[PDB]
Amino acid sequence: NKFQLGFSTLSEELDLESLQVKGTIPKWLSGTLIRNGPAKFEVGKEKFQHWFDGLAMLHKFSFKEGKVSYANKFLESKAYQSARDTDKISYREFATDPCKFTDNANVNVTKIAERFVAMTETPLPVEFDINTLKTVGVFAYDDKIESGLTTAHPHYDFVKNELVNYATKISRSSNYNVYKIADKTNHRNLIGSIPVEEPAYMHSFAMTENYVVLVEYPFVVKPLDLLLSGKPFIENFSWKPENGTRFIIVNRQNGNLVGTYKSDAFFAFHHVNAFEKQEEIFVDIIAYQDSSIVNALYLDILRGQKTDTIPTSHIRRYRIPLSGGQVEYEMLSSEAVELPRINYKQYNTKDYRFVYGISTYSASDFANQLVKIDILRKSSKIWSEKDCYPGEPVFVGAPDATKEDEGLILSAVLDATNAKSFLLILDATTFEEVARAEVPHHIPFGFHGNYFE
Numbered sequence: 001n002k003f004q005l006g007f008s009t010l011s012e013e014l015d016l017e018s019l020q021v022k023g024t025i026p027k028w029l030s031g032t033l034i035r036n037g038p039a040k041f042e043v044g045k046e047k048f049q050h051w052f053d054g055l056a057m058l059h060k061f062s063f064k065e066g067k068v069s070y071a072n073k074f075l076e077s078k079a080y081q082s083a084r085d086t087d088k089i090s091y092r093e094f095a096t097d098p099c100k101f102t103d104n105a106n107v108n109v110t111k112i113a114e115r116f117v118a119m120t121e122t123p124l125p126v127e128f129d130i131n132t133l134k135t136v137g138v139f140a141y142d143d144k145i146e147s148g149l150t151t152a153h154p155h156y157d158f159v160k161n162e163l164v165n166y167a168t169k170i171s172r173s174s175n176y177n178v179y180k181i182a183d184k185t186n187h188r189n190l191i192g193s194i195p196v197e198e199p200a201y202m203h204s205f206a207m208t209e210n211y212v213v214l215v216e217y218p219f220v221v222k223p224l225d226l227l228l229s230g231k232p233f234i235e236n237f238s239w240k241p242e243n244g245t246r247f248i249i250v251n252r253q254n255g256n257l258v259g260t261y262k263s264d265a266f267f268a269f270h271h272v273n274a275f276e277k278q279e280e281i282f283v284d285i286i287a288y289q290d291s292s293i294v295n296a297l298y299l300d301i302l303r304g305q306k307t308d309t310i311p312t313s314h315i316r317r318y319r320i321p322l323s324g325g326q327v328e329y330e331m332l333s334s335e336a337v338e339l340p341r342i343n344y345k346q347y348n349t350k351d352y353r354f355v356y357g358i359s360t361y362s363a364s365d366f367a368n369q370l371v372k373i374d375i376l377r378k379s380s381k382i383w384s385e386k387d388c389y390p391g392e393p394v395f396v397g398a399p400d401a402t403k404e405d406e407g408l409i410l411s412a413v414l415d416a417t418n419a420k421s422f423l424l425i426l427d428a429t430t431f432e433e434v435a436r437a438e439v440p441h442h443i444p445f446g447f448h449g450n451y452f453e
């Protein structure tokens, strides 16, 4: 196991004005890339069980006409602050309990009410200063919407300038609460509540021009088990393929229920993109056969010799006939893909051609390449390097771009032989390297980041 180091704690927090650049970073790139992920996998004697459980650390890559500055700090959440001060796991994580719920926002980052927030799947995000990476505190919403579980994968409507998400109220009468947030406010407007007996773990969802599509994988929890059973969060979820996958379509303007459509059981973390065509909706999902991937991302497996027990996922385009009939799918690529990203700003909710992600196909190593899938003419473009393990490829469109794949791809890459990470920058069109920035230490394998102008 050569990628061992990527699942090891990073104690060191620093703020360096310059990183050693090899190449040329386009002048027009003058924004900030914020990477989020786990960077502390134990608290003294107690070890975190799952990859998702590790305490949040933010990594900042700010650009100034060729130069690139770097800073990293642990998110000073109550989860972290309690661990640091008591040397005891204090809050309930995704798959680890101590001996109310966690603010360990280690999944993603966005802006809400023009404030930078780190997110996880618990109700309240954590506000941080993009300048200092200091933690402001818990970001309270100004509304009466109830929730126990939500996503760190909100959508953004650029036309209406709305953040769109859902939150599950987990009670003896549970609801999927689909909501929106207008710019310069922290008030959530309830679009619609879908009642549900046994809520499903939906890490993300699909948004089209008119609709929000909740794809309800049959990986479900009994609310009372979550409340009473003395077992970590994810251990209370059960795979029930008899139920099949339910596509719940909600009009994201008037909150009307368009319809529910069923397919054969499957699981997914990440949606890629969705769009409407004539009397049909197309939902592109990074799908697994079942929920076994969840139990594969425990650290003792990820750190272990047996790599080939981690299930692979593929881009499946599900076609929903609004007219009627069961939902069917086809594969857009034979390549194994995870952590998918697109030209989000321009082509989200719309018909598109290009997907970027990590490739997990195990041709030589596990998670050892970045891939660019061409949906139109099939085929793909690959990036890799000896004993290098790249992170989520973040697309950034070029100024006044006429094409979908005109811009840059930013990826945090772990060099195992060097025992240190570097920020890879690829031309989105050719998918070949233009520059890279050297980081003094290793950046643990994170989840999601975003580029802010």
Ligand SMILES: [Cl-]
Residues within 6 Å of the ligand: 172, 222, 223, 224, 225
């Ligand atoms: Cl229950």
Ligand SMILES: [Fe+2]
Residues within 6 Å of the ligand: 107, 153, 203, 269, 270, 447, 448
């Ligand atoms: Fe995710």
Ligand code: NA
Residues within 6 Å of the ligand: 363, 364
């Ligand atoms: Na090979």
